[PDB]
Amino acid sequence: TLQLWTLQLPKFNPYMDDVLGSWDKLHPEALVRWTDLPSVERKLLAAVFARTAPDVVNLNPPFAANLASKGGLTDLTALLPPGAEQNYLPSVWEAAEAGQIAIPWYLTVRLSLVNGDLLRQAGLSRAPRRWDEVPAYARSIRERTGRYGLFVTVVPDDSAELLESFVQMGVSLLDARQRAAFNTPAGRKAFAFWTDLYREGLLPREVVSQGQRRAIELYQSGELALLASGAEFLRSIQTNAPGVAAVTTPQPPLTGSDGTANVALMTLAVPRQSQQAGEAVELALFLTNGTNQARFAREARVLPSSLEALSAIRAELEVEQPSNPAEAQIRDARLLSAETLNTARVLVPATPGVKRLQSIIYTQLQRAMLGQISSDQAVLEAEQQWNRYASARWP
């Protein structure tokens, strides 16, 4: 039997129950036992210590790089059928220094869910689309409505949107040698950007202590004018808070002057300890073929990495006839995500130790937002702490 490990998937039990069921009908010799987890490295280490490593593991570019730098992922090129990469988007297939360590699965382009009713209360007609327009926008929301314009968490190991904003703001995080590269005019400007927003009462005070689940809660309460989220969460807004969804419009995500948006890549990898690597590759290919990826794109309102499924999903969206405004809203969001994908890139560099770097930056930025140190003081402390870590790991 094979053990499949997926990341943060309750709402998608029926999808998994059918596709894995189909797999079990096709491959009775390698039945799948599925476990979904949130905190992934601790559980992989325990299974590998017991010499019971899973066969297919769901990863993202940052975590996949930490594992592959240590020789833990199978080079799939040896086992992949010839012309298997032809079935995937080339930009996302090549998004995996240790060879081909992962097969692309699905991906998400997050949009700006804008509360249009809060905008009219603030005397605004639309939400900003670039970060240098965020302060003026946030002030108008804060003073005329009392609500908050946006919510970006600085809890060290929560969402990476803050670190992604650094990249969108032109900040260079690491050089070749893995040394700190953000003590630059861009990095100091980015640190001051977030410090000044918090100190001026423009951000919710709990951004230093709560993650995107609080942002979700604030938007559904009508207390957040812009929520960085995808199409799938829009349907739960429709059910949980119809008053807010009725005045919600999907909008392009916030970017920097370069325009690039972020895309969250989900992949499937085969640990080197796996004793059924060939069957594991077959399972990863089955989960990511045209039919299964298209079906998951519909049920999850997500974008696939399969060319066949991506074109099929784009085609269904262009000719979909929604029966009510709710379905039309969901169609508008999914279509905007599919259109944004042509300009979106992966922004957190798929390098080892990026979560250590995120934690150091978020911690120092947090000290500056609370007024315990200056912004430049946070930059220096972050730079020196990262170089402490980087000299020990990569001398």
Domain identity same for 152 and 238 = yes
Domain identity same for 92 and 122 = no
DSSP β-ladder status, 56-59 and 2-7: parallel
Domain contains 341: no
Give the Cα-Cα-Cα angle 8, 10, 13 (nearest 5 degrees): 105
DSSP β-ladder status, 261-262 and 344-345: parallel
Tokens of 140: 């108008």
Length of the chain: 395
Inter-residue contact 306 to 87 (CB < 8 Å): yes
Inter-residue contact 157 to 141 (CB < 8 Å): no
Dihedral, CA of residue 208, residue 129, residue 337 and residue 262, to nearest 10: -50
Beta bridge partner(s), residue 174 = 180
The distance of Cα 264 from the centroid of its chain, to the nearest Å, equals 4
Domain identity same for 241 and 199 = yes
Exposed, middle or buried by CB within 10 Å (0-12, 13-18, 19+), for 190?
buried
- Number of domains composing the chain: 2
Domain identity same for 254 and 175 = yes
Domain identity same for 43 and 183 = no
Token match 């978020």: residue? 362
Domain identity same for 125 and 21 = no
Residue that finishes a domain, picked among 301, 319, 337: 319
Cα distance between residue 249 and residue 265, in whole Å:
25
Helix (H, G, I), strand (E, B) or coil at 337: helix
Domain identity same for 118 and 224 = yes
Domain contains 30: yes
Tokens of 136: 């003026």
Domain contains 6: yes
**What CATH number does residue 282 fall under?**
3.40.190.10
Cα distance between residue 367 and residue 374, in whole Å:
8
Domain contains 32: yes
In the chain, the N- to C-terminal Cα span, in Å, equals 42
Q: What is the DSSP secondary structure assignment for residue 324, as one 8-state letter?
A: S
- 40, amino acid identity: V
Cα distance between residue 217 and residue 215, in whole Å:
5
- For the chain, helix, strand, coil in percent to 5 are 50, 15, 35
Beta strands in the chain (DSSP E): 2-7, 32-37, 56-59, 103-108, 111-115, 226-229, 248-251, 261-262, 264-269, 303-304, 344-345
Inter-residue contact 353 to 324 (CB < 8 Å): no
Helix (H, G, I), strand (E, B) or coil at 109: coil
| Cα radius of gyration rounded to whole Å, the chain | 22
Domain contains 184: yes
Q: For 375, how many CA atoms within 13 A lie in the half-sphere containing its CB?
A: 18
Domain identity same for 92 and 210 = no
Beta bridge partner(s), residue 303 = 107
> Residue 249: CB partners within 8 Å, gap ≥ 6?
113, 114, 116, 329, 332
- 382, amino acid identity: A
Cα distance between residue 354 and residue 360, in whole Å:
10
For residue 111, give the nearest of 282, 327, 313, 338 by alpha carbon: 338
For residue 365, give the nearest of 220, 198, 217 by alpha carbon: 198
Domain contains 325: no
Beta bridge partner(s), residue 243 = none
Exposed, middle or buried by CB within 10 Å (0-12, 13-18, 19+), for 169?
buried
> Residue 288: CB partners within 8 Å, gap ≥ 6?
88, 103, 104, 105, 268, 305, 306
Domain contains 331: no
Tell me the helices (H) and strands (E) count for the chain, helix number first.
17, 11
Domain identity same for 180 and 285 = no
Domain contains 334: no
Q: Where is 369: in which H helix or E strand? A: helix 354-369
Q: Where is 190: in which H helix or E strand? A: helix 185-199
Inter-residue contact 347 to 369 (CB < 8 Å): no
Domain identity same for 145 and 231 = yes
**Count of beta carbons in the 10 Å neighbourhood of residue 249:** 17
Tokens of 364: 């120092």
Q: For 40, how many CA atoms within 13 A lie in the half-sphere containing its CB?
A: 21
Domain identity same for 371 and 224 = yes
Domain identity same for 354 and 301 = no
Tokens of 181: 């590269």
Structural domain of 69: 2-108+264-319
